[PDB]
């Protein structure tokens, strides 16, 4: 996250930390055995992490569960990124509780001018790499389709969605994939890419999940 602050130990209940030995992407946590993230992050040896606020130092409240499987979107393109979404399912049920609870899909999408938070421990640089311990926030409101369209003409499709600020300082960034855009208590948003880091007029785009809540209900009701 580039020009957010420190969110707060566990002030940000569903986050998760993909782990292969290193944070590599951020994702959601839906109920107790679900988790939801980039289909660009997919990869074998998954351990999600739960509880997390330093990635580097167990302080208590980590709960580490390995990934029984991950579904990729059938229809994801990852020349376009059009249909980045992916479903974890857990090895073994997560402990909810106050520092570890899940997030609301919505019930419709969110439209322009929406205040949204994202958070992540990716890169904090827009020009080079600094890692954070703890978890990065930042509040984006989401863009109109004219502009994010106006911004990567040509690349946009209606399963994506532009946040972010055009004046560049503010952003999400490698690191940050996968992770939640929660906007009114609801999951509306997956980071999922976007030209470089806080440069001016080139926003995230994100994967707009209300546009998937019938596909995640169905693979959940059948796996
Ligand atoms: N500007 C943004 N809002 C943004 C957000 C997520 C990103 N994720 C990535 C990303 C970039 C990668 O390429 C690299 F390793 F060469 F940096 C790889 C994975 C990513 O998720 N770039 C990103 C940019
Ligand atoms: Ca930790
Ligand atoms: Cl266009």
Redesign the pocket.
Known sequence: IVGGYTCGANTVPYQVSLNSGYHF?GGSLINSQWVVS?A??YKSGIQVRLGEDNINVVEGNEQFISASKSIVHPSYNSNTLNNDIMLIKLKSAASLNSRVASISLPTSCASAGTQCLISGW?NTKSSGTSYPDVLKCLKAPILSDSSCKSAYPGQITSNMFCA?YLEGGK???????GGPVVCSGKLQGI????????QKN????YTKVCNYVSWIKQTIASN
């Open positions: 992407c980039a660009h992050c990716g972010g952003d999400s960034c490698q690191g940050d994939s980071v999922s890419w976007g030209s470089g880091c806080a080139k926003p995230g785009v």
